Amino acid sequence: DIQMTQSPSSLSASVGDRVTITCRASEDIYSGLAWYQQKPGKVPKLLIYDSSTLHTGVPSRFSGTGSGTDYTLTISSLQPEDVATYFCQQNYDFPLTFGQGTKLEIKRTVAAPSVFIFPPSDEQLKSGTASVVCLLNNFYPREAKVQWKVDNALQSGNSQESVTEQDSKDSTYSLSSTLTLSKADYEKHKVYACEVTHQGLSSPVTKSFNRGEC
Amino acid sequence: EVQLVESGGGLVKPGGSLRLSCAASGYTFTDNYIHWVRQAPGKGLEWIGYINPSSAYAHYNEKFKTRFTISVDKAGTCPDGYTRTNYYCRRDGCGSWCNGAERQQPCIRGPCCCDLTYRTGKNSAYLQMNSLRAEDTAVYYCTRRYYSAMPFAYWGQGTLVTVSSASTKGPSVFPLAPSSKSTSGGTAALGCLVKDYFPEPVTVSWNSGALTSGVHTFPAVLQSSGLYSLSSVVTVPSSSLGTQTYICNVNHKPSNTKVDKKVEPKSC
Ligand SMILES: [Cl-]
Ligand SMILES: [Cl-]
Ligand SMILES: [Cl-]
Ligand SMILES: [Cl-]
Ligand SMILES: [Cl-]
């Protein structure tokens, strides 16, 4: 089979910049190469075929070059809606094979998260479990540290985090962290706190609540 | 419009089988091959095979030949002014012989014999998969080329196939209620916690889709219990919290669980 190796695995660049993604085939594919754009949950969109031909509706700031085994996709005047995974596909030979993808991030100016903490609902507590949620909203860059504290004891191993797709207009991220405790443990403690460290914050920021307080 | 609409995906236990369907409409069904492609988490896309609906000939990636079968519906229609016979069509008011497959295959202009054809509308291709294992978990697409010698330009929406021994479970939906300390005249946050479901996926909307600005629906996380959880949040004006209604519409089709959850400031 023809193995397609795409580089880099990810890249980050500012609006208006120019970036290049490379695809290398394990043998000569004679410019039988297509490039696609894919966003999370959405279907692939065909950008380029025959290594350099733009498909309908594709802006000309996308351009494909290359020959032999080595091809390049170049995106100029990078736009915020270009956040996506890009992959190549060779059409020379069966089995048709794809590169592993390149994820593209837009670099924007630092933006601090707005932070919100949510206590567990009474309905959930009937289940015997308590989920505490900390939201970090609309921040950049993606790196961020969330620390949970329960009556000033640091919690470790009992939370999970998720991050949204970089926003296609404002280029921010948002993040949710959920701390899970038994109802019994929840009811034995008073102060629940989410502490957030992020480049846009001068010092870490803590949002807290007291169990049972309206 | 050209549409490929997939269905049939869902949870299957190791060793089991599943048939997916790709309903194609908006173009002459026999004019283009239908391919199947899959995408496992992290891994890149993987081509499975194709079928030519004109001939029902299928060609497979060697990796999948033993376990996967691509097929299409049988055609059973003869054009107007033709009458069906054993396996082909006969033109009304003709009787002479017709030379086997050669003259019972393409329908040349209006011949004495013409092959059976599909009706306009939805016509389907299928992907049958058996002896599934965990590494076959993926989103499965059907897709077709824009034209001969051009790449895949039309894609089915994708259907999720989950190969696992875990049982189906519908989510509980809990409020992330707006804080009583929300800034006067500022911005407040609220949300829905969609907890403990299996398999993926769940969808969330707000106010039946009328509320989209400020919404963030997070990727699910797989908990140590083997169940998924996710959150959906929205920021709104603090001043709207007494008046405007906020309902998250959760749908976990794998368990037939639809929930509308009103989210409001907690009373004391
Ligand atoms: Cl190509
Ligand atoms: Cl085709
Ligand atoms: Cl397995
Ligand atoms: Cl099993
Ligand atoms: Cl999900």
Residue numbers in the entry:
A (entry chain B): 1 to 214
B (entry chain A): 1 to 268
Direct quotes from the study:
A subset of bovine antibodies contain an ultralong CDRH3 (1), where a cysteine rich mini-domain or ‘knob domain’ is presented on an anti-parallel β-strand or ‘stalk’, which may constitute the entirety of the paratope. We have previously shown that the knob domain can function independently of the antibody scaffold to create an autonomous fragment of just 4-6 kDa. From these immunisations, knob domains which bound to human and rodent albumins enabled engineering of chimeric bispecific Fab fragments, via grafting into the heavy chain variable region (VH) framework III loop of a TNFα neutralising humanised Fab. By this route, neutralisation of the canonical antigen (TNFα) was retained but extended pharmacokinetics in-vivo were achieved through albumin binding.
The two knob domains were inserted between residues A75 and K76 of VH framework III. In SPR multi-cycle kinetics experiments, FabT-aHSA bound HSA with a KD of 2.1 nM and TNFα with a KD of 73 pM. FabT-aHSA crystallized in the space group P21 21 21 with a single copy in the asymmetric unit. Superposition of the CDRs of FabT-aHSA onto those of FabT resulted in Cα root mean squared deviation (RMSD) of 0.54 Å. These structural data confirmed that insertion of the knob domain into Framework III had little or no impact on the structure of the Fab. In contrast, K74, A75 and K76 underwent large movements of 4.8 Å, 4.4 Å and 6 Å for the Cα atoms, respectively. K74-T77 and L116-K122 (the latter equivalent to K76) form a short, twisted stalk which is stabilized by multiple hydrogen bonds. C78-D115 forms a large globular domain containing 3 anti-parallel β-sheets (Y82-T85, Y88-R91 and C113-D115) and a short α-helix (G100-R103) which are connected by 4 loops. Disulfide bond C78-C89 anchors the globular domain to the stalk. At the core of the globular domain, there are 3 three consecutive cysteine residues, C112, C113 and C114, that form disulfide bonds with C94, C98 and C107, respectively. The knob domain occupied a solvent channel and exhibited high local B-factors, relative to the rest of the structure.
